[PDB]
Amino acid sequence: QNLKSTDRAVQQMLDKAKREGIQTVWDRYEAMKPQCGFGETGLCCRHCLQGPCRINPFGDEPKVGICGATAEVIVARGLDRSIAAGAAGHSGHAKHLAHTLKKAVQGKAASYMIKDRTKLHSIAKRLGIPTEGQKDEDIALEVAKAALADFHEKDTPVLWVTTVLPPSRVKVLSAHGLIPAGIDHEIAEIMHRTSMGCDADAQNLLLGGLRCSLADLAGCYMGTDLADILFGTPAPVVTESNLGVLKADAVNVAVHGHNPVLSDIIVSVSKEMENEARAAGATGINVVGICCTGNEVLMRHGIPACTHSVSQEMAMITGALDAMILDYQCIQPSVATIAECTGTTVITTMEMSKITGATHVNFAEEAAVENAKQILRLAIDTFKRRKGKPVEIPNIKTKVVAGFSTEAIINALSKLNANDPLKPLIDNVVNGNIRGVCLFAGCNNVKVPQDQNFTTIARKLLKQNVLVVATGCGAGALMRHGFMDPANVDELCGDGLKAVLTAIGEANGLGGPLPPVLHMGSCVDNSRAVALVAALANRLGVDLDRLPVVASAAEAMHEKAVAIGTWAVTIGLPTHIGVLPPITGSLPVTQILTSSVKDITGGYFIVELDPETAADKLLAAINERRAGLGLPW
């Protein structure tokens, strides 16, 4: 099973699924082989009813689409629609939070409130909204109105792009016409220009894709900002991860999907319902996380992470998962079918994300506590139904220190330099104790043995003194293999990095180091890494494409991860992707995305499926940035 996942708890559940005859994502992948080589290379188009069209990567006809679309047009149009789909997911998420904040401060959703007033005021000031002598509710109404205004054209560009990057980077982007006019405006313009008989020039298409990726960045940054206002900015927390966080004698409830508007309420209301659970024979309600909504409640409340991404079905295979509470994105719809076998109650809550065979309980923010109570009573009823049933929870878990928002990182560094917190970090980049920074982001993918690329690349970078930060299911992979436990610093980190993590943790009163990898949150919280990187660029007086900072979507899957990788390149970063994207059928498009975009934005993709080689390429990219700053490497 180690060919499927490197996680030992997942391996144990794969054995259980096998002997019980429950089909998994790895079995559905095996049944799909061999996969179509036209789609793998990007050489397929279904954008009109004269299709499907394809182009042979090599050989004879077909060489061109029926309307005359070339390989480079077809590959660029498909990539652009992927970017637009990812932007559409993050900005649906962000819009959901904007409408929740508006409702809250208008007295229409009493379950929600302004928790981080300090963040509210800093965002308002960044946006140019006056705060002095204003009521908090009025300030918040204006921030929610500004959030919703960024979805359409208006007399300013998207402010969650132009106010969050340094002016020099905004100027580079503006010079190439890449600043978005409105988030949903760009998504629609992508779908237009990629439709039949429209844009048919690869460079023009890809410039439109870079602009739409910045609409995705705006939706990510907006979602972090609004979730911090409503639910609190994360601070360091300790918890646990992997399937051993499930408890046979508890009501086990996973929150899965993305939006904390739902997850955060499940967590607080589950606390009020402890006695009701105990009357049912349980010890209480054990809320556990899956995917990004799990990261959101891990970061803010220390809720333990059960599993992530490709292995999500395995939590159900234990037999102890009483409920799986869903909103949207990254939920394998197989869960509705596996539930019939495992007894889990799978519950959907959003009108635009239903799964045939799952129970639907409408969740309205205006009725959030009552709707949560209804959902959790379903969970309790399910617990009661499995009294006396054996379960198989692998007794496997790791310790996880997390909660490293950019505010938390700056506060930690301020213990070493109160009025110039970024300087101790920059000092140690200059003296070589920190070689550079790498952000691990994005999904697992069934084509890659689960977590193998994240852990292989992270181990090599940590030994080379790279400061490693992580989000999403990249953070999930690293946490489940011990990379967020400070007890593993001696084993994993080079001496320079160890000295730095130790000096910071000791200054913060822990009698020990920060963990080997800093968890910066969910996938929208890739925006927190942008805030940190932009702050370092501003402090140094250089643009982001001069910093020794890289990114790695080492096991990418979702269209959201394609959008995030593309805005990482657009803001100036060398960005690794560890799975094959559907671009190899066009050498001109590949050369744009891996080489000539450097002359436009300073960033570039690094496509490399072998993780040791990928680590070497990421180190060479870091070191080339060090050399360009005049630093040893």
Add this chain to the structure above:
Amino acid sequence: QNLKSTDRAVQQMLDKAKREGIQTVWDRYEAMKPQCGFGETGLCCRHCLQGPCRINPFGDEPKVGICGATAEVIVARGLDRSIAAGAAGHSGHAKHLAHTLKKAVQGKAASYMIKDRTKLHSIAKRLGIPTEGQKDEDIALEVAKAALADFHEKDTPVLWVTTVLPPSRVKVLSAHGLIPAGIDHEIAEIMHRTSMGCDADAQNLLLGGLRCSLADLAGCYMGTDLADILFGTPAPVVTESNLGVLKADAVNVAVHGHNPVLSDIIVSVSKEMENEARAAGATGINVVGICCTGNEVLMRHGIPACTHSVSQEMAMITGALDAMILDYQCIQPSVATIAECTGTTVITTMEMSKITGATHVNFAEEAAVENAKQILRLAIDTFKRRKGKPVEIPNIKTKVVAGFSTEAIINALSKLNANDPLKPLIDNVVNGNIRGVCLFAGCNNVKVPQDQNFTTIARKLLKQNVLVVATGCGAGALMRHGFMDPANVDELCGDGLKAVLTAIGEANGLGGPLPPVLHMGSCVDNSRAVALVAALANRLGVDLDRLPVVASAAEAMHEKAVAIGTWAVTIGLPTHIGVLPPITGSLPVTQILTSSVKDITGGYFIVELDPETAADKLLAAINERRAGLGLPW
């Protein structure tokens, strides 16, 4: 060549392309055979990097996508993205016109103006915008602001849906949650819900698709409304169609694409440049139309139509096409390559629609006359380069009476009943002289011998006394085969229909009938057919799903035609599609779209590739509506 096109001028140019070795759309189709059966049936998904996934229509594995997506989820998600892409094209078009109207009345684009003040005031009143004592420019600013507001969420739904359909139809739609919240909002929500791990219930997905099709209807109706304000509402005109409208001794300039913001200015400025053309040795500038922008200037100015849709390359093959002036949509990018062989100057003008190898001349409304002059001087230079070169213009053309806006149809009928213009039409539906109404819409498609389904179905319906209206390249097909020449009424029309067309034409002073088919304009001007049908439903006090009115996208191609067919079903019409849509891989989705949607909206798709059978099915749908009104049939 008659297996490729039923148009004799196209056949002649196919012979020329063959002996000159110029590859055409029919040759690129032959080189694509056999096409992929997964894509033909809809059983392919590339929505994440674990793909491509496919499902065998029949047999053994694969049976399900890797994430667990079923055939019915995969088929519904692909259809929904098609609908969203079509909506994105029509609402880009409509947004372009809204920004042009705003610029005009703000003094920022003097080449444009309020031409139809009567239309401006009626639209304002429909929208609830006060006009009394207001300046026209202020009224127009408010209508342009209302147009742009319909792209995003606000405190009202999309008004270019809710104010253009009767209240009883809006109520049906609202009860099913199908009224759009904002045009670009719905496009983004489609791209979100169809991304991996989101909506996975076929009925839920398709309900979202119906709602997004009404966002497409809003963009079509908005584009007709704003183009009529700026350029005038069409009235009856006489002109000609087919390749014989090209003139060897003139500068031949085709306008191709969609938006009259560009086409209409080319037409008026070409008039001022007659002397400059003559100094170059030409008789003048001969502007001719291709596709919908050609329909726009045919309807308003009587500009002759050269060709349409699938045969667009053939205008270039004559050797006499000096320039092809493009904005966006439905332009085969092959034209840039064929230009190298034929000498034509292909010119793009919009930033989001470029074609490698074509000349780009930015067109800005603020500089429209100068930008047009630059473009037309390129055309004149090209004319000069082909002095002494033989050309081969087939001497084949038809007479075309067109310009039947809904206002023009009502005015014509008012000659028979001044204060109740719709009554003479309803009288003749009741007495059987008019059996019902059929709208032909949409494209040609290279899989169908060009025009064969339009002409075959139209002939059978006209003999059965159906009033036939047409738009887009359906109107193009019918005009090129003589169906818009009143000299062909005796041959084509049944006695009842002939009596009606004759009584109306004689009352309008023509000493003869209206033509056999009424040209209602471009593809956005399918909205004019909605206005007529809604007016008849209001006059009769019934909803649209009780009227003997059907639609036929007999040779559909573009994602726009999929969106239009879907809103035709959503507003209550039996809607034929004459090509195979990628739905047959899911029987549950096919049964929803061809049968159970009747219980939701009263409309339904009729998929039928054999045009005689399709005509019989359309007549049976008309007659079933007659029976439901208590009428003989």
